[PDB]
Write a protein that binds this ligand. Structure first.
Ligand code: G1P
Ligand code: ZN
Length: 573
């Protein structure tokens, strides 16, 4: 009971704050999605976690750090609870005034972005490796968000890397034990300090659910998913963090059956499966959808910022299309009614399906590089309201992270509005704006410098006067513009180069080659292919059949097979 903990704290007295010596590491550079390593890096290596955490604290100014509030939460993967305890003790020893932590450490990435902005916190620490597998032999990550609720920009992350490279002492409160299970306030008496330290354990779902409740019309959702004539659906949480949100939001408040949700219990190893939503890693969901029983299926990733949208019989609306449908009927969501369409954005590898809705509605569209930085830059300038990434990313400017369950609720709102099946909505959209046949091949973990050699030699081949205008086909395309995609940010003036080789032809079709920044050992080659078609006779056809020429040209030009040794892609989406 609470009384036992209170009396215990009273008898043990004030908790000491102590400095301990440490040695720095070399690979604590936070990437596009924080700092991600294998779990043993954080669980077994001495003071790895402590070094990184204290680097994060040092990256925050002392003024903003004394007395301020910080959100802490994660996707409930292995080691998250222990690392959260360490974060609590260090925060207590580092002048933080209050930690708002999700119950049992559970807090989806959009939930953290939401709470940060709501409680006016100086930032948040997210214990997630996103779509990467968890468990003792899995992966583990730490993502630092700032006061706008979004990821820490390159300045902050670089400061954390620099500080981490030379750090030699940290502060911790080792006698501090905190129960992450019981909701409510939890105060701690610290030695040599006058103000008590506060750990507030909040519901993992409540605030997020309130935000969705003010974004969507939950009456229409209740009538759609709740009644006897309900729209049969199946939501696969992949044993990820979105489980509690699915159950408390869609099932409890919105009234959909409890057997509508599956795998809605977050497991520290994500049930052994890969917490990534796509047709390859969500086989159970597509095969359950293959019997012709539900009209809408959806999957999420580990931390809840990605989503997969499926229709009846397993119909697959690829992310690049999903964001274009949401844009095409964006005014079915009360939130965008309130804000208006501030702008549209997509990453360069993402198909141009959104571009067509932007051109038809006279709305600015920004083709940004891979990553959140540019999307947040645009959102803070009131120049972006809906954005999406091909990597199953969909989000708006309601927060500063992408949001999977938000995209699902948007799809249910537009389903209830248009009163059609997903396949009908998609087909009508294709005939309305034309179809962007899209595919992406991932060649996972190939020996680098073979891939880098393919990129350098490929780019040299692309910049040649005897290249622009050359004929290719496999029973015809002619090169129009080959380059290394550069992007100038129109908000802060930042310039970004490489970002992926582009082959654009005269029919609008594009072949993009990108080296991954998500990877650990070696390198991952990503091949995107995007071909447009308006001839409504050709709007419907098998995309892997419709695209096969462009694929053959992509590997024949890149010499992928001869330089990597691989004969088939690791995953096709
Ligand atoms: O490995 P990549 O391609 O560099 O990065 C990948 O993970 C990132 C973080 O989720 C996403 O923003 C990218 O869209 C995705 O392509
Ligand atoms: Zn994610």
């Amino acid at each position: 009971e609470w009384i036992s903990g209170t009396y215990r704290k009273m008898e043990e007295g004030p908790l000491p704050l102590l400095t301990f010596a440490t040695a720095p590491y070399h690979d604590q550079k936070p990437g596009t999605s924080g700092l991600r390593k294998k779990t043993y890096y954080f669980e077994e290596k001495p003071c790895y976690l402590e070094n990184f955490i204290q680097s994060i604290f040092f990256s925050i100014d002392l003024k903003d750090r004394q007395g301020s509030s910080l959100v802490v939460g994660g996707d409930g993967r292995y080691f998250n609870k222990s690392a959260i305890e360490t974060i609590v003790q260090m925060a207590a020893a580092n002048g933080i005034g209050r930690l708002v932590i999700g119950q049992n450490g559970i807090l989806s990435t959009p939930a953290v972005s939401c709470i940060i902005r709501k409680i006016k916190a100086i930032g948040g620490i997210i214990l997630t490796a996103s779509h990467n597998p968890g468990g003792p032999n899995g992966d583990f990550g730490i993502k630092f968000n700032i006061s706008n609720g979004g990821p820490a920009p390159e300045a902050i992350t670089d400061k954390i890397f620099q500080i981490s490279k030379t750090i030699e002492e940290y502060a911790v409160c080792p006698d501090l034990k905190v129960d992450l299970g019981v909701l409510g306030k939890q105060q701690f008496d610290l030695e040599n300090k006058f103000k008590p330290f506060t750990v507030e354990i909040v519901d993992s779902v409540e605030a997020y659910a309130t935000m969705l409740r003010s974004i969507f019309d939950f009456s229409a959702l209740k009538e759609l998913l709740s009644g006897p004539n309900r729209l049969k659906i199946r939501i696969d949480a992949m044993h990820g963090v979105v489980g509690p949100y699915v159950k408390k939001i869609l099932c409890e408040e919105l009234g959909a059956p409890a057997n509508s949700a599956v795998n809605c219990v977050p497991l520290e190893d994500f049930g052994g499966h890969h917490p990534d939503p796509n047709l390859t890693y969500a086989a159970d969901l597509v095969e359950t959808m293959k019997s012709g029983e539900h009209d809408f299926g959806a999957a999420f990733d580990g931390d809840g910022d990605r989503n997969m949208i499926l229709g009846k019989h397993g119909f697959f609306v690829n992310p690049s299309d999903s964001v274009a449908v949401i844009a095409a009927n964006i005014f079915s969501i009360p939130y965008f009614q309130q804000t208006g369409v501030r702008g549209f954005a997509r990453s360069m590898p993402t198909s141009g399906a959104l571009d067509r809705v932007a051109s038809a509605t006279k709305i600015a569209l920004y083709e940004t590089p891979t990553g959140w930085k540019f999307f947040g830059n645009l959102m803070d300038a009131s120049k972006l309201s809906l954005c999406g990434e091909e990597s199953f990313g969909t989000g708006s400017d309601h927060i500063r992270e992408k949001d999977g369950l938000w995209a699902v609720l948007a799809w249910l709102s537009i389903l209830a509005t248009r009163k059609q099946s997903v396949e009908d909505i998609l087909k009508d959209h294709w005939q309305k704006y034309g179809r962007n046949f899209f595919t992406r091949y991932d060649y996972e973990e190939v020996e680098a410098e073979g891939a880098n050699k393919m990129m350098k030699d490929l780019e040299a081949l692309m910049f040649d006067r005897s290249f622009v205008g050359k004929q290719f086909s496999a029973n015809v395309y002619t090169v129009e513009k080959a380059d290394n995609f550069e992007y100038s940010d129109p908000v802060d003036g930042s310039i970004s180069r490489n970002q992926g080789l582009r082959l654009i032809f005269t029919d609008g079709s594009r072949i993009v080659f990108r080296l991954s920044g998500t990877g650990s050992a070696g390198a991952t080659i990503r091949l995107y292919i995007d071909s447009y078609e308006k001839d409504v006779a050709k709007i419907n056809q098998d995309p892997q059949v419709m695209l096969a020429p462009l694929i053959s040209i992509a590997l024949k030009v890149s010499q992928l097979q001869e330089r990597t040794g691989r004969t088939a892609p690791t995953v096709i989406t």
